[PDB]
Amino acid sequence: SVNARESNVYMAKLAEQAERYDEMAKYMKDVVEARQSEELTVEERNLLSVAYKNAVGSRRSSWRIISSVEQKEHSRNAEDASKMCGKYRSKVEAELTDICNDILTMLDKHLIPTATSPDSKVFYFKMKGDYHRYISEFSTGDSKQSSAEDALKAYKDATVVAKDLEPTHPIRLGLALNFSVFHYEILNEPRAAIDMAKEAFEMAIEQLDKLSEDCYKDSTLIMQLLRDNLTLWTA
Amino acid sequence: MSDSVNARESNVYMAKLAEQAERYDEMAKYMKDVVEARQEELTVEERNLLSVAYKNAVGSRRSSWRIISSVEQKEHSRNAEDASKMCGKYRSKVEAELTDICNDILTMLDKHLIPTATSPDSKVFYFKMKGDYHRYISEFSTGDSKQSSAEDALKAYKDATVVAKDLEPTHPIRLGLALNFSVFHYEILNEPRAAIDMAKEAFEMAIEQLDKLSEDCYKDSTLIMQLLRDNLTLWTA
Amino acid sequence: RAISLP
């Protein structure tokens, strides 16, 4: 009955070690779609995220490298070569679209509807915002507007639930981290990014003392990324 | 054939872009289309792009194979037979990819690249590249298959060695030949004495003539002389 | 260039 689950999870772990993430993602995808309304474990949930994050991560990184060369050529009036970069970028975009749509479908149909605890709901609402954001990174015109609006809503929805978590809860901080990034890079609203990140960070600092030895570094890891972004963003 | 000069310049450009994008399977394919569509020799630049492309394509699968085999064995050692068998099936999947990629480049070598090679330089390069790809196959083959691909590799490295006798002992291509050929003896054939003898002989021969190291080469040549020593140091303990 | 959650 639940034999296939233990086994897909074993394979997902195995593919992560082998660094074959499209396969890691397909294993974890098969866990999600099978589930009778049972919630993914913390361990599974993280594996799904790691797998999608890496599968998408590598295409995003190539996307950026390919774009930069495209604009390098465009500016050196080498038009024949510019178009070649463009055809190649589109191909990477097709892959990005597929992988993002795949995980977002799983979130809309399976993950978000079945989640109980404040933890899970924030976790999955944040994922959806993230993947809409990834689509927003390369999209144009009305695709961009659409995915921008769904990411925004997803982060808002996540923000609403997150108020039930302590200001130093790592899942609450991570949301503010990505939510502020969304504002700055996609919406081009530097003021609301700075505020959001500043708020999340100050609210956490106000409470670092009310934490224990074996728990505070998970928090500081992320409060640190928050400061690093603020430093970059503030002239 | 004006359309042929452009098609080649274009694939080279895309091979280079795929490399910057770190999409090596597609890099390999661009360079393959350069090979399959040529008149009877690739330049130094292309030859090198071809090798980098296949090397990385195969490299990530080699690295995965090793990790999966290791887990397969920890399992066997733990009497967790189910898990092992799964690891086993997963290892096969990667083996099938390796086989296809090595055979792809070997076919190009056999039918296209070795036959049109003029220079002793490029003859060594391509024979060496051929022992390497048979060596990669031998890495995961067993019994009879391993023997047959080990024999194809042995012959390619010897053929490269014969021609290499026309390069200075300090030539980077000759030195790289000795490094891989000795690695092959050690790892594939399990002949630690022939390996140590071959690396030692290539290092000593280069060192007999350090005064003849040219300014255009002494970087890559020393690098290789240093890997030869590192291997000797390891094999020697 | 801003880091998002690893």
Added chain:
Amino acid sequence: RAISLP
């Protein structure tokens, strides 16, 4: 663990 040509 022996290194072949980069």
